[PDB]
Design a protein around this ligand. Structure first.
Ligand code: FC8
Length: 278
């Protein structure tokens, strides 16, 4: 830690406190995360290299405490969404952000790395219009907002697939468009029933095997499904189609990141500049 200076606290991440730090030998400004089997597997994440993934620079194990050194970005998507809530993020920028996030997820999924806990606070942005995913692979290597959790997680499935990340990103997409969280649960059951009240209570027809899930209860409220045009207005039918595919209940059938990239919603994608106030 004497290898850094002006070490300054940004705030709480998922696994510990994130600091902004300046490296001694290089003058590099980095993000240093102090975390409250895992060493080798986190170390392997130093090999991931993609424009839409926050680079993991170094892993430091000292005094039985783990420090992860990452590339530094200046803002998260939560802050940007809050700053933009008056006016809304323009559609072309939502589109660009979604496209980029999908490309990051396509890459990680193709290397068998899941996120498992995507949320606007782990999506980081810069002045050039890039958005990047922070924390891939940490949940598996290591072994609180529920708002983005997939229904198979809430129903107690033990085996996690890449579909959980698509669900979370769909929730984020909806939130960028409406300005409000899609399923802001206050408890695990409230999270599940908010999903249920919007998308309808799942059944064997739309989700084979759901009623044998660990936490499934045959006494679960039987709500009808609502229309997407009620859920994410005034999003156009391309965007509503893609979101419907990202929020399919059956994880085997939820759209993949690769397939989502091909959706007609992205035919006119561009890369706008955000106006960031730093
Ligand atoms: C470890 C990867 N990593 C790289 N750059 C960051 C980073 N930059 C940042 C700097 C100023 C304001 C904001 Cl909003 C974010 N912030 C976080 N995490 C924060 C945890 C506290 C709340 C804000 C952020 N979510 N991690 C970063």
């Amino acid at each position: 830690m004497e290898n850094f200076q002006k070490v300054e606290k940004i705030g709480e991440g998922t696994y510990g406190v994130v600091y902004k730090a300046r490296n001694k030998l290089t003058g590099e400004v980095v993000a240093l995360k102090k975390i409250r089997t895992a060493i080798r597997e986190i170390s392997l994440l130093k090999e991931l290299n993609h424009p839409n993934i926050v680079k993991l620079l170094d892993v430091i194990h000292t005094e039985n405490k783990l420090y992860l050194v990452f590339e530094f970005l200046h803002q998260d998507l939560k802050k940007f969404m809050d700053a933009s809530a008056l006016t809304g993020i323009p559609l072309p920028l939502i589109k660009s952000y979604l496209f980029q996030l999908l490309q990051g997820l396509a890459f990680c999924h193709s290397h068998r790395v899941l996120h498992r806990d995507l949320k606007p606070q782990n999506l980081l942005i810069n002045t050039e219009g890039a958005i990047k995913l922070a924390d891939f692979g940490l949940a598996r290597a290591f072994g609180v907002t529920l708002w983005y959790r997939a229904p198979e997680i809430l129903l107690g499935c033990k085996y996690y697939s890449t579909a959980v990340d698509i669900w979370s990103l769909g929730c984020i997409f909806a939130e960028m468009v409406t300005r409000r969280a899609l399923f802001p649960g206050d408890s695990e059951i409230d999270q599940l029933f908010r999903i249920f009240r919007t998308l309808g209570t799942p059944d064997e027809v739309v989700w084979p095997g759901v009623t044998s899930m660990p936490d499934y209860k045959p006494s679960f409220p039987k709500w009808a499904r609502q229309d997407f045009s009620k859920v994410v207005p005034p999003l156009d039918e391309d965007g509503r189609s893609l979101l419907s595919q990202m929020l399919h209940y059956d994880p085997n059938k939820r759209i993949s990141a690769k397939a989502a990239l091909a959706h007609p919603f992205f035919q006119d994608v561009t890369k706008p500049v955000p106006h960031l106030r730093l």
